[PDB]
């Protein structure tokens, strides 16, 4: 029952990091221009990429039982992402018009589910990690 925040940190990081941004980005979103936003979102999406790989390393980090769910969760996050990425690709063009705050708001919405999505990700894992704790700790 030590602090195994070694590799679980990398996994728990992306999740948070991306999340912490999902929100923050929302704040600096309104202002964030179409030149600084295009990437902004691109970043969140980029993080996912690495996150996926990170998960693979986390897969084992957790006890057998939170595999499928985890896998299904990955697609879950991406989902919102994909829809989030598109939202941007549009906002980028639906900003110079005038109905920015409108479309921009939409993004926020996802940001809400996103934060959760990312949560439900580890949330499940958290249920696994324990599955190991209260069972038979090896190392």
Structure tokens at 34: 């179409």
Domain 33-136 maps to which CATH number in 2.40.30.60, 1.10.287.130, 1.20.120.330, 1.10.1270.20? 1.20.120.330
Please tell me the distance from the alpha carbon of residue 113 to that of residue 79, in angstroms, as a whole number.
11
Please tell me the distance from the alpha carbon of residue 69 to that of residue 84, in angstroms, as a whole number.
22
Residue pair 21/44 in contact by the 8 Å Cβ criterion: yes
Domain 1-32 maps to which CATH number in 3.40.50.1000, 3.40.50.970, 3.40.109.40, 1.20.5.540? 1.20.5.540
- Strand spans (E) along 13-107: none
Please tell me the distance from the alpha carbon of residue 103 to that of residue 107, in angstroms, as a whole number.
7
Experimental method: NMR
Long-range contacts of 80-88 (CB under 8 A, 24+ apart): 80/110, 80/113, 80/114, 80/117, 81/44, 81/45, 81/48, 81/114, 83/110, 84/41, 84/44, 84/45, 84/110, 84/111, 84/114, 85/41, 85/42, 85/45, 87/41, 88/37, 88/38, 88/40, 88/41, 88/42
Strand, helix or coil for residue 67: coil
Please tell me the distance from the alpha carbon of residue 33 to that of residue 91, in angstroms, as a whole number.
10
Residue 39 belongs to what H/E stretch?
helix 34-61
């Amino acid at each position: 029952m030590a602090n195994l925040d070694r590799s679980n940190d990398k996994v728990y990081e992306n999740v948070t990091g991306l999340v912490k941004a999902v929100i923050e980005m929302s704040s600096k979103i309104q202002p964030a221009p179409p030149e600084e936003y295009v990437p902004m979102v691109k970043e969140v999406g980029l993080a996912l990429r690495t996150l996926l790989a990170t998960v693979d390393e986390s897969l084992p980090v957790l006890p057998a039982s939170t595999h499928r769910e985890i896998e299904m969760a990955q697609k879950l996050l991406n989902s919102d992402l994909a829809e989030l990425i598109n939202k941007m690709k549009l906002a980028q063009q639906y900003v110079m018009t005038s109905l920015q705050q409108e479309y921009k708001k939409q993004m926020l919405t996802a940001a809400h589910a996103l934060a959760v999505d990312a949560k439900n990700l580890l949330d499940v894992i958290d249920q696994a990690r324990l599955k190991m704790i209260s069972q038979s700790r090896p190392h």
